[PDB]
Write a protein that binds this ligand. Structure first.
Ligand SMILES: O=C(O)c1ccc(P(=O)(O)OCCOCc2ccccc2)cc1
Ligand SMILES: [Ca+2]
Length: 256
């Protein structure tokens, strides 16, 4: 499941990975969700790849997450920035629609996408209410390999039944889904035996995940490599806790 050459901190911080990405547009009339764009590596010689499904926040679309497409997928992943059914979907519905996008990748995706996909190594990512929907899709399908809630928003504060390795990225100055009442109590109610981490960004707002951010990208790549690819070549950056300057607080259940 290991793809690409051995990583240094300069390769994870790279804006482009060792693979050339291609895309495939998915209609909004696909069952269960509002469609999106499927970013996938072109070179099929290193084998098949795992996949992640990315959800945008409340009253937002995949354009708010588009920069995760070619970025992560060039490091060796299938990335699916999806649109929801309506722009007002609650976090619970964004969980379902995250799973209907993954199922679409397995059961209905184009042949070029189907051939490069390992349908057993799947994951979810999401921003704001898409991060709450990231937490729900874990509860809804415990077979998922990774879960990455970006500045997540949810009314439910306790998430002790989650079994997926979850990486909650926080934003210091977020006042829409503030970390003290959302991102932190979400992480602390995750099971202490779960492989998990909490990264809070200094001076960041609710919308920091919507523009390219080397701090966000380098450890989303490490997290998706470690748990979707079972790639222990990326534990060096996760354990012990990263000590970057753009990070104001880091918490984790290291080592893993
Ligand atoms: O009180 C409420 O009604 C309420 C509703 C929704 C939220 P949420 O945290 O989901 O906001 C989504 C932010 O992301 C969407 C976005 C992405 C990129 C650019 C601009 C906007 C919080 C409170
Ligand atoms: Ca639809």
């Amino acid at each position: 499941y290991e793809r690409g050459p051995d990583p240094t901190e300069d390769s994870i911080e790279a804006i482009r990975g060792p693979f050339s990405v291609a895309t495939e547009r998915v209609s909004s009339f696909a069952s269960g969700f509002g469609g999106g764009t499927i970013y996938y590596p072109r070179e099929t010689d290193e084998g098949t790849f795992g996949a992640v499904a990315v959800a945008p926040g409340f009253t937002a679309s995949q354009g708010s997450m588009s920069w995760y497409g070619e970025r992560v997928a060039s490091h060796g992943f299938i990335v699916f920035t999806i649109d929801t059914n309506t722009r007002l979907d609650a976090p619970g519905q964004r969980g379902r629609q995250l799973l209907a996008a993954l199922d679409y990748l397995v059961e209905r995706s184009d042949r070029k996408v189907r051939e490069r996909l390992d349908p057993n190594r799947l994951a979810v990512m999401g921003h704001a209410m898409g991060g709450g929907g990231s937490l729900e899709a874990t509860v809804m399908r415990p077979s998922l390999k990774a879960s990455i809630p970006l500045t997540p928003w949810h009314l439910d504060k306790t998430w002790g039944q989650v079994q997926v390795p979850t990486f909650i990225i926080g934003a210091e100055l977020d006042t829409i889904a503030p970390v003290s009442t959302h991102a932190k109590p979400f992480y602390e109610s995750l099971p202490s035996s779960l492989p998990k981490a909490y990264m809070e960004l200094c001076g960041a707002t609710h919308f920091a995940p919507n523009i390219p951010n080397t701090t966000i990208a380098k450890y989303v790549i490490s997290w998706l490599k470690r748990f979707v690819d079972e790639d222990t070549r990326y534990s060096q950056f996760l354990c012990p806790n990263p000590t970057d300057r753009a990070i104001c607080e880091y918490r984790s259940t290291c080592p893993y």
